[PDB]
Amino acid sequence: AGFQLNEFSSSGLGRAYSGEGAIADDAGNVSRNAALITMFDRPTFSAGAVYIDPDVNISGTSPSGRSLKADNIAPTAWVPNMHFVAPINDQFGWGASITSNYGLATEFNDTYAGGSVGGTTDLETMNLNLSGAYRLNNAWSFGLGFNAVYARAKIERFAGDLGQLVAGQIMGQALAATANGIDSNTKTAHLNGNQWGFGWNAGILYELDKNNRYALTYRSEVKIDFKGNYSSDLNRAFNNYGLPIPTATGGATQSGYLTLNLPEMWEVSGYNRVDPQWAIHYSLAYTSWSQFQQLKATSTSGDTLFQKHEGFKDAYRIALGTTYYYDDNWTFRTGIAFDDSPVPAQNRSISIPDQDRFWLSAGTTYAFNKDASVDVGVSYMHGQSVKINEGPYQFESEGKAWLFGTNFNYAF
Numbered sequence: 001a002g003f004q005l006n007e008f009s010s011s012g013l014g015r016a017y018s019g020e021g022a023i024a025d026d027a028g029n030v031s032r033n034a035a036l037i038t039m040f041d042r043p044t045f046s047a048g049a050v051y052i053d054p055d056v057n058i059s060g061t062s063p064s065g066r067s068l069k070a071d072n073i074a075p076t077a078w079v080p081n082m083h084f085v086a087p088i089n090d091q092f093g094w095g096a097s098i099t100s101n102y103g104l105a106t107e108f109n110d111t112y113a114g115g116s117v118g119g120t121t122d123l124e125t126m127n128l129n130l131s132g133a134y135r136l137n138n139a140w141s142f143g144l145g146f147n148a149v150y151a152r153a154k155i156e157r158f159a160g161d162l163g164q165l166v167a168g169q170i171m172g173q174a175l176a177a178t179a180n181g182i183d184s185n186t187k188t189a190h191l192n193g194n195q196w197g198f199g200w201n202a203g204i205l206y207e208l209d210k211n212n213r214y215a216l217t218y219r220s221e222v223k224i225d226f227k228g229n230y231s232s233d234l235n236r237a238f239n240n241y242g243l244p245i246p247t248a249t250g251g252a253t254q255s256g257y258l259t260l261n262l263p264e265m266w267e268v269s270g271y272n273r274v275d276p277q278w279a280i281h282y283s284l285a286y287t288s289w290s291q292f293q294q295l296k297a298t299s300t301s302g303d304t305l306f307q308k309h310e311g312f313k314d315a316y317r318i319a320l321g322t323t324y325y326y327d328d329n330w331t332f333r334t335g336i337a338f339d340d341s342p343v344p345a346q347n348r349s350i351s352i353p354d355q356d357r358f359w360l361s362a363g364t365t366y367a368f369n370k371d372a373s374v375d376v377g378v379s380y381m382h383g384q385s386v387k388i389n390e391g392p393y394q395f396e397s398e399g400k401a402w403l404f405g406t407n408f409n410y411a412f
């Protein structure tokens, strides 16, 4: 999925996030399917983080004749996570979890010649969840949850070398020599803002027996109405001449309004304890990116200041993986998973460098005694190399990523 993230559990990172919401070895999953809450007999707690280490690269040459090579344009990332699960009654349970389901970080140098389309793009998301569940009979459980998302975002763009490109094409003369005076790192657009968003989630859990069980779950859409600073160092004169360029302010910071839709996600999952020391778990996540059509930043007067058309479309994430319950102490796991890109080639962009991803993964849990247990997980996910045609340039891009992750567990 585009700029989506599934690292709520390092326990689950070991399995390619397969069967999640269906598995429940640790408190880690009640945030995935707040139905699992019914699975715990006592207060359980989990905490840790996932180090995401990408390696995305851009390659290509611009008509001006300057490289559009961009080495490692996706910073590392420390995505933490905390969850709590406790029983209220022999029929009700609640829980809370701090996790991040959405984020990005595609950061180009301020002097990249393709600057207009590859500046900086950040998006941090914190999702505080509070949900509860109730068990009808020994077969199914129902759960509803409330999320207060806190998003932090910031978009920047610059005049690539467009200047010299424009100033060339025009070969009203000083009108050229001037746009040749513009430098590579000219704040062509700056946006930023901190805002809260709200959403809900529900999950159903039909469990055939203590060793087999399935689940259907939903995470609502989540809109974020940003009200933040916006500006463009280009001269106001550059305006109203039909250019696709973004509204100029000459340095002036004008209040800006933008809205970010955070795709709903449907997920079906299954978990089986086939053998005393083996269990298999698969899932099929559906993330509706159709909800994320564009990025439009408006003024107080509702007029457009910035607007990039994304046009993503619904996508999915299939996942298969297993766990090897060696013994009271040692536990292992591995999984494969494949998730489809929302971005249709013809919209693909170096900003949201995205292509179909393949998941290979392996993990391990050591439990010192009954209450404690540490989790360690490794995941490597490669993907397809694709051609990107944006604005006046034609880039090429490739992406591979490593993700390591620890997590501690404890139950009273």
Ligand SMILES: CCCCCCCCCCCC[N+](C)(C)[O-]
Binding pocket: 004, 005, 006, 007, 052, 054, 074, 075, 076, 077, 078, 103, 104, 105, 123, 124, 125, 401, 403
């Ligand atoms: C503050 C968060 C920064 C996020 C860094 C983005 C890394 C994107 C790399 C693809 C990883 C996607 N995955 C694992 C979440 O599914």
Ligand SMILES: CCCCCCCCCCCC[N+](C)(C)[O-]
Binding pocket: 003, 104, 121, 122, 123, 153, 154, 155, 191, 192, 193, 226, 228, 258, 260, 295, 308, 310, 349, 351, 352
């Ligand atoms: C003013 C804050 C706006 C929030 C920024 C949200 C960015 C989501 C990532 C979409 C990538 C940006 N894009 C379309 C310009 O390439």
